[PDB]
């Protein structure tokens, strides 16, 4: 069925980097034309900013520009999120999203709460 | 888009 596997909480040191393991699944009925668009969000409920966007990065918020990267393989269903140069401001929740088709998109509500420490 | 809104 549809879903995403990632840790619920993750902690990193300011200045360092953080890697969030992530894997997603979708029904074998599966369509294959959308090229699967992966998108990570930050503060989905509040300001909801884009951390990455396989579609077009021009949609990525200036806050995460060049400070985040998708370490995955759609062909393996890997969505790992790499955070470069951590800062305290990076603390918060991250949620993944992927789209195979217009009416076949999914968002992980669990997300991953990232808290940057010293 | 839909579902969650916003
Ligand atoms: C809404 C959405 O816009 O995300 C409609 C999607 O079609 C639906 N996906 C499926 C497979 O039904 C999603 C989905 O239910 C939620 O993202 C689950 O968290 O909801």
**Cβ distance of B3 and A48 shorter than 8 Å:** no
Distance CA A79, CA A51 (A): 12
Distance CA A64, CA A114 (A): 14
Which residue minimizes the CA distance to atom 6 of ligand 1? A105
Compute, in degrees rounded to 10, the torsion defined by CA atoms A57, A6, A34, A48: -40
Question: Which residues in chain A are contacts of B3 at CB distance < 8 A?
Answer: 107
Superfamily of domain A1-118: Immunoglobulins (2.60.40.10)
Boundaries of every domain in chain A:
1-118
Whether residue B3 has its Cβ less than 6 Å from ligand 1: yes
| Method used to solve the structure | X-ray
- Cα of A24 to ligand 1 centre, how many Å? 14
Q: Which residues contact A49 (CB under 8 A, 6 or more apart)?
A: A41, A42, A43, A61, A63, A64
Per the DSSP assignment, residues forming a β-bridge with A79 are: none
Distance CA A57, CA A61 (A): 9
**Cβ distance of B4 and A107 shorter than 8 Å:** yes
Tokens of A10: 């993750």
């Amino acid at each position: 069925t549809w879903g995403v596997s990632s840790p619920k909480n993750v902690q990193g040191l300011s200045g360092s980097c953080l890697l969030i393991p992530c894997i997603f699944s979708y029904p074998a009925d599966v369509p294959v034309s959308n090229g699967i668009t992966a998108i990570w969000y930050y503060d989905y409920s509040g300001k909801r900013q884009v951390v990455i966007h396989s579609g077009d990065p021009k949609l990525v918020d200036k806050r995460f520009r060049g400070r985040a990267e998708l370490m995955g393989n759609m062909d393996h269903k890997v969505c790992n999120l790499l955070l470069k140069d951590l800062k305290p401001e990076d603390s918060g929740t991250y949620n993944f999203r992927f789209e195979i088709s217009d009416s076949n998109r999914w968002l992980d509500v669990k997300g991953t709460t990232v808290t940057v420490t010293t | 888009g839909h579902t969650w809104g916003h």
